[PDB]
Amino acid sequence: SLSIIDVASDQNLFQTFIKEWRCKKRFSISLACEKIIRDDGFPIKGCDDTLVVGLAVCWGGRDAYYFSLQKEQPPSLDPSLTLKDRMWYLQSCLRKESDKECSVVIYDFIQSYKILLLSCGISLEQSYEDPKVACWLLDPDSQEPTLHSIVTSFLPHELPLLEGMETSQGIQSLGLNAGSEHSGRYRASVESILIFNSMNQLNSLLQKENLQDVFRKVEMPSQYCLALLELNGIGFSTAECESQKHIMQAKLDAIETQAYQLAGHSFSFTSSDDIAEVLFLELKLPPFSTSKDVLNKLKALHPLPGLILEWRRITNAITKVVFPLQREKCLNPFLGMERIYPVSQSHTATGRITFTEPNIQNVPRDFEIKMGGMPFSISMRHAFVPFPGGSILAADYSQLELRILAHLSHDRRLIQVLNTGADVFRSIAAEWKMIEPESVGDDLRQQAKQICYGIIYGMGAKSLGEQMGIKENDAACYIDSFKSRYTGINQFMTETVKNCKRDGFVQTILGRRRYLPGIKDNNPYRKAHAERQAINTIVQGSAADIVKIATVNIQKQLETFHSTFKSHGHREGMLCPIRGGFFILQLHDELLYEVAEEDVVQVAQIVKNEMESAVKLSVKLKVKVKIGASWGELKDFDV
DNA sequence: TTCCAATGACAGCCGC
DNA sequence: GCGGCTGTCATTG
Ligand SMILES: Nc1nc2c(ncn2[C@H]2CC[C@@H](COP(=O)(O)OP(=O)(O)OP(=O)(O)O)O2)c(=O)[nH]1
Ligand SMILES: [Mg+2]
């Protein structure tokens, strides 16, 4: 039967618990947060409403050890056990000694690591296991796990423990979710037991699938690096953002006024119906869809489709980038600057990492606005700044997905091109626009990039037609030419589809599996979609494995040369100038670090060396390093 | 439904 | 009238 042992109710029970805890190689913890320096627990960063009041420990069966973190006010607190004494014994059991294998199981490890550091001043220092990450590893296309879905799939006999605990069907940890009428003590105790027992079953399934080395050496260390990134945040200049906003808003106003004069009346730029009425019924243009590709053709015939396209581009930068950044920015009183603290998301189809609240990966590339015939550069990335005196360092793998595709297809032509040829997207753009490499603008090089990856990942003549502005038959010939030039690639496509049809899955370089049962489907679309996912998952998933390994290996190196704090949070949670490199953003083939002036040479060497050594392929993994006063103004830096 | 992956606002519809 | 669902359309890699 379910029991909660209140270890802080008696000095003698406490020491017996501490002695037993110090013997464990494996245990679960769950933090207890409730709604309201205080006597009744630790304030949480961002919420004036909720407290960490305790945590629960489990190391087997249906026994939860509830460890209170309240000064005053289950049996009561033994007053000889001061909060300072409890905090000592807590930090002691949660930090590694020398040559001591210890694993802690935490549902939503990242969120718990941060609350323990920032709220309680405790830095977890053991091997971590998150059953959310184990679920992902067993089926990456599964829905995001909840405590309820984990217990349903892996511990179904304990579903009754979750009866009347409706927040177990939300994403957030049951212990962390103070939006319940159940006590933090009960919620954390139930979670501790469900997660410890669930993780035993998830460990057995990882072992059967041969994914346990991936889980311990790549995925959970990757989660630890993402915890440091989320504690670091990324520096943000509200002033740079506002001045860009005002230029963009002035251009939106002039576009609206000119659109409405051409239309003859007001219309909503957000209503496809209104735009269709104006373009096709009122202006009688040739066609009813109002997509990017339609308006891109029609801008050659009338000014209004071009205005529509620019309206959507600029409205996007204002409503989906400026508004959320201004809303989410947060004063860091130590660094003396504003930062943004995005949330990492590792539950993805191919093992990429993305961000939410807000998704900083989607900050526009540089673009141009013309007003009264004067051009203004809008560089939204220029609003992302290092701490005063610091630099932004970006290190990007050159053509990582192409290098992996060369390696797996042994294509001798693609290997030559990458080894000593110029930019392949420039070669494509040059041949296409009847020019030499040098004239290519950013927007044209991106068009060529879309063409090259598009063709490789199974894009058809109809779509290539629209992108290249040529007839299907002309696009179809261009695909044949491309496929003929790189015959190794085409053999690897057919060999990957054959092997997927047989097995029901594809595998990345590290052994992660994606299940594609659409591959057997009789429906031509679903079959072809699965075949395209089969090819793309192997290459894109492999690239995401290499970047994770790089990230983990850089973090180990930074912490050896680490006289000083592993994140900005390790200074917050502490309560001597800034030294070292701070992981601030991942961009799929590119890592951004914020680096102290004195450390930029050494951190640049470490980052480049570790990214180039991540794995050994048939081809060299080339890395370009850039450095600058903002994400928007990065300059080449020879390392 | 015919490049893949991702987040996320927003019309418009409908069952409740 | 409200909330969920489902495309549309944006941007990034
Ligand atoms: N299928 C597909 N993959 C893409 C597309 N754009 C980018 N990717 C993938 C493959 C390359 C990888 C990194 O994106 P980048 O824009 O950096 O591509 P890159 O080849 O490194 O280019 P660059 O040299 O400009 O950094 O993301 C696209 O349009 N389609
Ligand atoms: Mg790149």
Side-chain angles (χ1 to χ4, degrees), chain A residues 2-24 26-34 36-44 46-70 74-94 102-124 126-162 164-165 167-180 182-271 273-281 283 286-287 289-296 298 300-356 358-411 414 417-418 421-426 428-435 437 440-450 452-454 456-461 463-469 472 474-476 478-479 481-482 484-490 492-497 499-500 502-519 521-526 528-534 536-555 557-561 564-571 573-596 598-615 617-619 621 623 625 627-634 636-637 639:
Chain A
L2 172 87
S3 67
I4 301 174
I5 303 98
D6 293 283
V7 297
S9 54
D10 187 80
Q11 177 71 253
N12 223 98
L13 176 66
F14 191 75
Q15 290 303 344
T16 308
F17 162 75
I18 291 303
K19 177 180 138 221
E20 266 289 288
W21 197 5
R22 284 173 168 169
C23 292
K24 300 301 160 181
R26 302 186 48 86
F27 53 90
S28 77
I29 60 174
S30 176
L31 292 183
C33 315
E34 279 177 3
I36 293 151
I37 314 151
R38 331 181 84 267
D39 295 1
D40 55 355
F42 294 102
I44 293 168
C47 174
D48 296 53
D49 288 303
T50 312
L51 287 205
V52 178
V53 300
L55 77 157
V57 184
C58 184
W59 57 61
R62 315 182 81 261
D63 294 328
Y65 300 87
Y66 182 69
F67 189 126
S68 178
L69 294 170
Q70 303 190 291
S76 67
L77 307 189
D78 185 342
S80 84
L81 268 165
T82 72
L83 183 54
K84 284 172 179 192
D85 296 341
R86 275 125 74 209
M87 295 314 290
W88 157 265
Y89 281 107
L90 184 57
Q91 175 65 79
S92 163
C93 293
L94 292 177
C102 195
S103 287
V104 62
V105 184
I106 310 177
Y107 182 91
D108 200 349
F109 159 77
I110 293 176
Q111 189 169 29
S112 292
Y113 181 92
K114 290 164 35 182
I115 292 169
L116 270 169
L117 180 52
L118 299 174
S119 282
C120 310
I122 293 207
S123 201
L124 288 168
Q126 266 143 341
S127 294
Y128 318 113
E129 290 190 4
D130 188 335
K132 297 184 77 161
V133 170
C135 287
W136 173 71
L137 212 35
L138 291 167
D139 181 357
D141 286 305
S142 68
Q143 186 167 65
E144 251 181 87
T146 68
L147 179 60
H148 193 270
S149 93
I150 292 175
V151 172
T152 298
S153 297
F154 302 115
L155 205 71
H157 60 291
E158 295 286 354
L159 273 176
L161 287 196
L162 283 192
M165 304 209 74
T167 59
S168 62
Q169 310 187 17
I171 259 80
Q172 193 174 37
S173 165
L174 187 66
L176 290 189
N177 196 331
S180 167
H182 293 284
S183 84
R185 173 180 171 271
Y186 189 72
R187 287 186 279 101
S189 298
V190 154
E191 189 175 353
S192 84
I193 289 156
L194 292 183
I195 295 300
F196 181 80
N197 287 290
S198 284
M199 192 68 234
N200 284 351
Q201 177 68 7
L202 285 167
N203 274 332
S204 294
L205 291 174
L206 288 182
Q207 216 167 298
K208 163 181 73 154
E209 291 309 321
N210 225 284
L211 289 175
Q212 200 173 43
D213 279 340
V214 167
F215 180 61
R216 295 194 293 202
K217 289 178 208 176
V218 184
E219 297 305 333
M220 287 307 307
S222 168
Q223 290 294 285
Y224 164 73
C225 297
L226 290 176
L228 298 188
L229 178 148
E230 291 190 23
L231 289 161
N232 287 335
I234 183 164
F236 182 73
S237 170
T238 194
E240 182 53 34
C241 201
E242 264 305 280
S243 87
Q244 284 175 17
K245 178 212 196 149
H246 290 134
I247 296 169
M248 289 194 290
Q249 190 58 59
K251 181 53 168 196
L252 275 177
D253 290 340
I255 290 169
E256 281 165 14
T257 58
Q258 191 182 330
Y260 296 164
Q261 51 170 275
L262 292 165
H265 50 94
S266 202
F267 66 83
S268 159
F269 281 85
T270 41
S271 168
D273 287 36
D274 285 327
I275 291 167
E277 172 209 5
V278 168
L279 291 185
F280 302 115
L281 302 181
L283 267 44
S289 175
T290 71
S291 64
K292 159 102 95 285
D293 289 343
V294 169
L295 299 179
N296 231 310
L298 293 184
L301 293 187
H302 197 272
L304 187 44
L307 291 183
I308 309 301
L309 281 172
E310 207 172 346
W311 191 96
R312 309 223 252 240
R313 175 185 220 165
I314 299 173
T315 290
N316 181 71
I318 291 176
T319 68
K320 303 283 303 274
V321 185
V322 171
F323 179 91
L325 294 176
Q326 303 279 45
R327 176 185 81 218
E328 294 303 302
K329 61 164 171 36
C330 175
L331 188 55
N332 181 329
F334 306 92
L335 273 40
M337 60 177 324
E338 297 187 291
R339 303 189 65 97
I340 293 171
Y341 296 93
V343 177
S344 59
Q345 167 64 276
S346 306
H347 189 112
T348 65
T350 60
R352 290 199 158 180
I353 293 159
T354 190
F355 293 91
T356 64
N359 188 4
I360 295 220
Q361 300 178 325
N362 292 355
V363 171
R365 307 172 71 79
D366 291 9
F367 67 97
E368 197 177 82
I369 286 170
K370 285 190 183 188
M371 289 188 82
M374 309 293 328
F376 295 79
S377 175
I378 307 298
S379 187
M380 304 226 70
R381 289 175 180 179
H382 187 50
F384 295 86
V385 292
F387 54 69
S391 299
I392 299 314
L393 182 147
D396 59 78
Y397 285 108
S398 295
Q399 285 78 71
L400 181 53
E401 277 191 34
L402 288 180
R403 277 172 198 282
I404 292 168
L405 182 62
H407 168 75
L408 290 177
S409 72
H410 309 133
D411 200 272
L414 176 50
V417 166
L418 295 168
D423 192 32
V424 208
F425 311 133
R426 267 189 192 82
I428 299 324
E431 198 169 16
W432 174 28
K433 295 293 176 183
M434 308 272 94
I435 299 202
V440 298
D442 191 56
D443 310 75
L444 173 50
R445 199 186 159 258
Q446 294 286 103
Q447 291 157 229
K449 180 184 288 187
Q450 248 217 108
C452 181
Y453 290 122
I456 289 168
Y457 293 122
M459 187 190 244
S463 288
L464 183 57
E466 263 100 300
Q467 236 89 117
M468 288 200 79
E472 185 183 323
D474 281 352
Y478 184 102
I479 294 175
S481 202
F482 192 115
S484 263
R485 204 174 166 73
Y486 310 100
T487 69
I489 289 175
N490 204 69
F492 164 82
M493 290 189 251
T494 72
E495 178 77 17
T496 291
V497 169
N499 291 356
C500 193
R502 199 192 55 216
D503 299 332
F505 63 72
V506 296
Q507 270 186 177
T508 68
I509 194 169
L510 283 184
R512 300 188 296 105
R513 280 181 220 81
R514 186 193 185 178
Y515 298 95
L516 295 174
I519 200 78
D521 205 326
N522 308 48
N523 170 297
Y525 170 85
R526 288 185 225 109
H529 179 53
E531 290 172 352
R532 294 194 292 268
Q533 287 174 303
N536 180 257
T537 293
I538 295 178
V539 182
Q540 186 195 108
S542 288
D545 293 347
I546 289 167
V547 172
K548 275 177 172 169
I549 290 166
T551 304
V552 165
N553 287 354
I554 290 157
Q555 200 51 38
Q557 284 296 121
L558 291 183
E559 283 178 24
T560 76
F561 295 128
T564 10
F565 305 79
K566 24 169 75 183
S567 87
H568 301 314
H570 289 81
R571 319 218 319 183
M574 192 249 302
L575 278 315
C576 184
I578 305 105
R579 299 295 308 259
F582 301 96
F583 189 30
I584 61 167
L585 192 55
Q586 203 245 49
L587 275 160
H588 307 295
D589 71 337
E590 179 186 2
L591 302 179
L592 290 205
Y593 295 88
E594 184 183 42
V595 186
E598 317 99 292
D599 293 316
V600 320
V601 157
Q602 185 173 332
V603 169
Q605 261 152 0
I606 290 172
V607 166
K608 180 160 140 68
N609 192 91
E610 292 297 340
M611 285 172 67
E612 286 186 337
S613 314
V615 304
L617 304 185
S618 318
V619 296
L621 292 179
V623 178
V625 178
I627 218 172
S630 90
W631 180 16
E633 301 208 329
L634 296 168
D636 290 337
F637 183 65
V639 194

